[PDB]
Structure 1
Amino acid sequence: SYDRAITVFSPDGHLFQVEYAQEAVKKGSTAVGVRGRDIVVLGVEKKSVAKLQDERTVRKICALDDNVCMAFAGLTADARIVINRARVECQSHRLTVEDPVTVEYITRYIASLKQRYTQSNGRRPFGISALIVGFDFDGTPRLYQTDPSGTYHAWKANAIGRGAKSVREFLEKNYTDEAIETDDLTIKLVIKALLEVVQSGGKNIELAVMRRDQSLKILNPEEIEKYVAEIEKEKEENE
């Protein structure tokens, strides 16, 4: 076929394409996600839409199961391939063991695929970074992220996409346990974090939640408008 090794080590101890394919993630849209204790929330910013067209096809948040949820960054086509393979894998797991698919399994599958994909003969590494949020058995909310290296890696809140350092710095001075007390406040916390990110006109703010005993609900962008309005009201109440 193509008998070659694309990704060679560096003379100073790197993989050029694994560390460098993170840049393609670094130049994509921003997306945050936190877990509350009973309601999980995530969403992407910077749709950067043409404001006058369809939007049901550009959806960056999808699902693999009725239990698990997606997000990503980087370029969208590799995400499309990885999501197709992940759907196949989770349903094939349901074929065997009769449980709903655990989130840790599907993250290990994605990271394992990504690593054996970088290892192989002449396959270009996946320049994406996904977020896999789900709440498996006994209602435990957990959230993991991926990396082009293939390191599933559990967090408590997100920092990917454009300017993720700023967003994580806001989450750093905003790690209050109080924020994950009121589900509405957790939603508003995602809105305030994404408000401390890009324009946040209330147009490219696409957010979806799951209350861990239901499926994902994509919110209609009038509720998000009232969320931004009450956030601005609390910001006025700060003075």
Structure 2
Amino acid sequence: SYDRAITVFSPDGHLFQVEYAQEAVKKGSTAVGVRGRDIVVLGVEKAKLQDERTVRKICALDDNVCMAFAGLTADARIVINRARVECQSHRLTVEDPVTVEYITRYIASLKQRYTQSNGRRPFGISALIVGFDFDGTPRLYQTDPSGTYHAWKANAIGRGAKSVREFLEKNYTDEAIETDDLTIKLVIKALLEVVQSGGKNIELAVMRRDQSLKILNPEEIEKYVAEIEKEKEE
């Protein structure tokens, strides 16, 4: 088997292969995540001849935890499958289900081991993992190709994620949090910054307290498009 050192330090102390993996994230579709009290939400950027279902970038990992990603879609699918395996394997070892921190720590640990083990280039993805814990607290974390992880109130990754995070930093108030409708509107506003003409080109899903994941179809999405643009005038 192949024992070559793939990821190594440079003259100036950079892990170039991890840095090039983060360039592969910045080309991928703009994924955005937002937290609330009762609800947690994810949304993604977007051809006429495709099945939307197959190229879905929002994926459930267990009954309580799901995730979004941005970057290389093949690399994403392996991390998602191995996350899904670890979620059930966690229940098999200690009965109680997975907290959002534990699965994020695992995905981070998996990403980090590919930046340091021989033969293997890093995973060219950043993820946005969301859900509800044992006690029922809502969570949103973010991993990246290096295998660092941090909790967030809201965050963006992908194309123009600076301009989305700049928008989120301002707009994330206590007013937008309180209701289920208002948190969803905030995600669509944020995606409308980067999405050149929104509506139809926005994937979007939600998670509530005890309930499982729920993707909103383009009919449900275009309802909230009307509720945003009317309120701007007033």
TM-score with structure 2 setting the length: 0.96
Q: Is the 8 A contact 1:61 1:70 kept in 2?
A: yes
Distance in 2 (alpha carbons) for counterparts of 1:6 and 1:220: 42
Could you tell which deviates more after superposition, 108-117 or 192-201?
A: 192-201
CA distance in 1 between partners of 2:68 and 2:76 (Å): 9
1:125 counterpart residue number: 122
Q: Is the 8 A contact 1:103 1:133 kept in 2?
A: yes
Secondary structure of the residue aligned to 1:62 is strand
Q: For 1:139, what is the secondary structure of its paired residue?
A: coil
Q: Which moved more, 1:64-73 or 1:195-204?
A: 195-204
Contact persistence 1:194–1:200 (CA under 8 A): no
Rounded to whole Å, the distance in 2 between the matches of 1:125 and 1:39 is: 33
In structure 2, the residue matched to 1:13 is 13
Higher mean displacement: 73-82 or 191-200 = 191-200
Which 4+ runs in 1 deviate beyond 4 A?
A: none
Q: 1:213 to 1:200 in 2, by over 3 A?
A: farther
- Do 2:195 and 2:201's aligned partners in 1 also have CA atoms closer than 8 Å? no
SS in structure 1 of the partner of residue 129 of structure 2: strand
1:51 aligns with: 48
8 Å CA contact 1:25–1:161 kept in 2: the answer is yes
Q: How many angstroms does 1:74 deviate by?
A: 0.4
For residues 133-169 of structure 1, give each alpha carbon's deviation from its aligned partner in whole angstroms, at most 9, with x where no partner exists: 0111221011101010001111111121000110011
Q: Over aligned residues, Cα RMSD in angstroms?
A: 1.1
1:30–1:160 contact (8 Å) kept in structure 2: yes
1:27 maps to 2:49: no
- Cα shift at 1:201: 2.6
How many residues are aligned here? 233
Which of 203, 206, 209 aligns to 1:206? It is 203
Correspondent of 2:94 among 93, 97, 100? 97
Are the counterparts in 2 of residues 7 and 122 from structure 1 also a CA contact under 8 Å? no
Shift of 1:200: 4.3
Runs (5+) with no aligned partner, structure 1: none
Deviations along 1:190-223, one digit per CA (max 9) or x if unpaired, are 1111112212431121100011211111112112
Q: Which runs of 5+ in 2 are unaligned?
A: none
What CA distance in whole angstroms lies between the structure 2 residues aligned with 1:129 and 1:200? 25
Please say if residues 6 and 120 of structure 2, whose CA atoms lie closer than 8 Å, have aligned partners that are also in contact. Answer: yes
**1:53, 1:8 → 2: CA distance?**
40
Between structures 1 and 2, the one with greater strand share: 2
C-alpha separation in 1, matches of 2:230 and 2:49: 29
Aligned equivalents of 1:98, 1:8: Cα separation in 2: 39
Q: Distance in 2 between matches of 1:201 and 1:43?
A: 12
Give identity over the alignment, percent: 100
